[PDB]
Amino acid sequence: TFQASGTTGITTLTVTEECRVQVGNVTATLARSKLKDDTAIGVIGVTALGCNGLQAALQADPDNYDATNLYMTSRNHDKLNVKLKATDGSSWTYGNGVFYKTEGGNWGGHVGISVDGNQTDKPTGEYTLNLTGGYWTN
Amino acid sequence: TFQASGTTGITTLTVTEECRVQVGNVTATLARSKLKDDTAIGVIGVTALGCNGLQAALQADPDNYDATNLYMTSRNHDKLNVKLKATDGSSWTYGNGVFYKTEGGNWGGHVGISVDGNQTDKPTGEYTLNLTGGYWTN
Amino acid sequence: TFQASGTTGITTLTVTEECRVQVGNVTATLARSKLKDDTAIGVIGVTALGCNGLQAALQADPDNYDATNLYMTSRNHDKLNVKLKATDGSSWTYGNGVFYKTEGGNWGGHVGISVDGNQTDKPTGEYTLNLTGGYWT
């Protein structure tokens, strides 16, 4: 079970055509044709404190998952299925919107987000994923 | 014709009285009496990539233009008419909410936003302008 | 009387359990047990210009004060009482949502936000305080 305790981090990806124009703050873009399985999207920093004896976890917003997939979502509820992996090779489990660390205790590092399955038929626009910090108990 | 492809950048101006207090992050402010033709408001970064053969463009939100003017808007739909100019002297055309580059191809730089006509009669408040990246076809 | 003129600064504090996980952009967290009187929460920059003859001022959102207290507020309407103090020792007055400088004129500095009274029973979540610039007549 996830218990919320911590802050929420936003990850944004804008799906574009091959010609694209970035305006203002620099944020990630990928052309439709580049939405292939395992394509890197972004990284999010994660730091777990005061967690001796407990397993660090992230929870996706309910706008970002269903029973089978984690996904970034557009303003029109278009969905880009994605997957999470810690960059340090540490062991985590994903299911039902929760990404939780196998070994307990403090940890700091980064979680990579990548495309989960070929999705070149998805539309252009801004997609967002919110992940909230907390811990997992059994 | 504007084809959406790219990200959106927001530009903000707070119109104030002569005595004004900036709280938090530093942002652009102008007293009502300083809303004179050609007064600089801000600049926004713009980068066109993958655009061989195509003209870079920006599109304003529908509640940032009308048939004659581009404008920043307050929460009460007050309109501060503004104009756009690439800071490197490159040639662009403005019409009907679209700012599009004359020469096709990749380009990066900045677009300056300035007051378009003396407007010292406009009220205090926060005014915003959103510009979305894409390209122009004929 | 407060007259609005200037910008708004948001200050956020996330109240956590003892084990907590910070994700993405760094913002302030404190565990419930750390909500002790005088605990530092944050600082906010404040710059007054064009204010010859007028006193610089901040106004809290209506959701952020009552006759007795200034407070950060959660989306569940929980209240964390806080207090303001300029970091340079300058003299300001707080009352009924307005923090205004005793000496008129231009000034640039920072205002510290701290916990006002022991409040270790407050619930977890994101608490916000919005302060808007202006001047006092």
Q: Where are the domains of chain A?
A: 1-138
Q: Torsion angle of alpha carbons C87, C93, C96, C97, nearest 10°?
A: -30
Cα separation, A37 vs A31, in Å, equals 14
Domain A1-138 is in which class?
Answer: mainly beta
Is residue A122 within 8 A of residue A91, CB to CB? The reply is no
DSSP label of A65: B
CB contacts, 8 Å: C48 with chain B? 19-21
C-beta separation of A82 from A115 below 8 A: yes
CA distance A44 to A111: 5
Task: Please count the other Cβ atoms lying within 10 Å of the Cβ belonging to residue C125.
Answer: 15
**How many Å apart are CA A76 and CA A86, to the nearest integer?**
29
Query: How far does the CA of residue C110 sit from the closest CA of chain A (Å)?
Result: 25
A41 close to C (CB below 8 A):
no
User: What is d(CA B40, CA B17) in angstroms, rounded to the nearest whole number?
Assistant: 18
Please state, in angstroms and rounded to a whole number, the distance separating the CA atoms of residues C45 and C111: 6
Residues of C in contact with A5 (CB under 8 A): 16-17, 19-21, 124
Assigned CATH for C1-137: 2.60.40.1570
Q: What share of chain A is helix, strand, coil (3-state, %, to 5)?
A: 5, 60, 35
Give the Cα separation of C55 and B61 in Å (integer): 39
* Radius of gyration over every alpha carbon of chain B, rounded to an integer in angstroms: 15
Q: What is the DSSP string of C94-115?
A: EETTEEEESS-S-EEEEEEEEE
d(CA C104, CA A28): 47
Residue A79, helix vs strand vs coil: strand
From the DSSP assignment, how many helices (H) and strands (E) are in chain C? Answer: 0, 11
**Chain-chain contact of B8 with A124 (C-beta, under 8 angstroms):** no
Give which of A51, A34, A41 is closest to A122, Cα–Cα: A34
Q: Tell me which residue has tokens 């009924």.
A: C96
Q: Does A124 touch chain B (CB under 8 A)?
A: yes
User: Positive or negative, the Cα torsion across A124, B7, A75, C126?
Assistant: positive
Close Cβ partners of A113 (under 8 Å, ≥ 6 residues apart) = A11, A40, A41, A42, A43, A44, A82, A83, A84, A129
Write out A114-128 in H/E/C secondary structure.
Answer: EECCCCCCCCCEEEE
Half-sphere exposure of A129 (CA within 13 A, CB side): 33
Beta bridge partners of A56: A135
The sign of the dihedral angle between the CA atoms of A104, A106, A108, A113 is: positive
> Which residues are bridge partners to C80 per DSSP?
C72
CA distance A28 to chain B (A): 9
CA gap B100, B79 in Å, rounded: 22
Distance CA B32, CA B17 (A): 6
Residues 6 or more apart in contact with residue B96 via CB below 8 angstroms:
B65, B67
State the Cα–Cα distance between residues C21 and C23, nearest whole angstrom. 6
**Site of tokens 């539309």:** A123
Q: Do C7 and B24 touch (CB under 8 A)?
A: yes
B23 touches chain C (CB under 8 A): yes
Distance in angstroms between the alpha carbons of the first and the last residue of chain B: 6
